[PDB]
């Protein structure tokens, strides 16, 4: 399982339900603070669908606690994202995934 340490919430009334867009402007970070991914630089917000099992599930069920406009430094266990194989060439196995996400709109 994951935990979520929030930064700055937004509306708090809305939460991601089934059949919805989910547009995030996230970045990434390995556990030593050595980042590898940031959708903010290429100016294109990541737009993944809910429940379709196309994102890694640590990003998925961790996004369930999010609200609209909420910014939250979450984290991920090794067992929820690339456990013993890793992404080949990019991240080694058995490594946590500290993130930094915020939701734009449309749940």
């Amino acid at each position: 399982g994951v935990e979520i340490e929030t930064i700055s919430p937004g509306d708090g009334r809305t939460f991601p339900k089934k059949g919805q867009t989910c547009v995030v402007h996230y970045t990434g970070m390995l556990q030593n603070g050595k980042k590898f991914d940031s959708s903010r630089d290429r100016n294109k917000p990541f737009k993944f669908r809910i429940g379709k099992q196309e994102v890694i599930k640590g990003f998925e069920e961790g996004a369930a606690q999010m609200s609209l406009g909420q910014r939250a430094k979450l984290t991920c266990t090794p067992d929820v994202a690339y456990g013993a194989t890793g992404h080949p060439g990019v991240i080694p196995p058995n490594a946590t995934l500290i993130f930094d996400v915020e939701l734009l709109n449309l749940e």
């Binding site: 930064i7 919430p9 940031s38 903010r40 630089d41």
Partner: protein, 420 residues
Amino acid sequence: LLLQTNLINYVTSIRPNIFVGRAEGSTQYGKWYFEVMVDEVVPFLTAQATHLRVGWALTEGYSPYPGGGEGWGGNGVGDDLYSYGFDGLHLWTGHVARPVTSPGQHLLAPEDVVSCCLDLSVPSISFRINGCPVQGVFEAFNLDGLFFPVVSFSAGVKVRFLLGGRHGEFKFLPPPGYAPCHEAVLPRERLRLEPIKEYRREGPRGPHLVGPSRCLSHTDFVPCPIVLPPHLERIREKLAENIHELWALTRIEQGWTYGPVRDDNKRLHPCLVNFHSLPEPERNYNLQMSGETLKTLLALGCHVGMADEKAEDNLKKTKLPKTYMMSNGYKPAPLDLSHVRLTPAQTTLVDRLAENGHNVWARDRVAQGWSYSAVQDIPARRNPRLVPYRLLDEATKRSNRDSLCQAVRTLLGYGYNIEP
């Protein structure tokens, strides 16, 4: 194993002119407090998040160079052991984040006001956000140098300062015993803001290159300052009588006449007649203080003897003028010594003479637990003249120098020669 590569933002910091330290002879207070409010901030002007931290930092060692730095760079407050800071949810010291448990916590929005505790008696620095306390302090640190508040801010941030009632306005009550920081300013310097260790300065003529600045030293606040010759006691009454003959007429031109009560607007002076026509301690105010200024005259190695005692009674005193007659009519004749004029060895000595008597008072005054401010606190025994002599301003430095000049220029005019 390889050279990684990334973009990163620029950053800088600024401070006001407040430098509170601690020493053995400490003329200062030792516990301070200040507030800074935030009114305008954009989180994302670029791909990297904006950086905004507020805290305290040492003098000689907190050197943020703008290009690059340590860790990953963009170094501000907390990136080393020379600073301590806070940003909304993290304590920052030594380039490692320390989280908080704060009620209603978030990073600094607009209309958010911070407040920080600073203590030097006990080593302790803590913060209070929106009136609410935070769960941590800083202790066990070294004290080799003064302390100043800072704000380390990245691009696209507008922030405001609160110092004290002359300039700022406090939006929260200070804690018990914590003075507002606007009064720690030294009187020779008007308060301002500046960057820490500049080397490029903009200007008319297409920039400016400055060298290293000169900071106030750590023990620079500490102040610092026999037998009796036989004829010196014989001149101890003759000098103090002529000084009392000049003490009367100087206060007579300003208003103070012969009055046995003590007032300024009523202008009543007890020794406005003569030296023997004064009360016993008021005459001893001229007499018994002269043993102190003579026990240090040989302690400076100044060679002086009972020389030219022939014309001490032949060359007479000044003329008792018509305006020199006071409201009681009394006007003694001060022994003016205009025939003996200024010599540079004595003129350099009389600066070192007149500084030493005032500076040894400052230890004995502050031995009772006196502390410094820029204004007067009588029940808190704080005085705006509780600094060593070269730290004073030249107007007050002029006041306690010519008062000792006539004590010497008449004595050097008596033939008692001054040697360096």
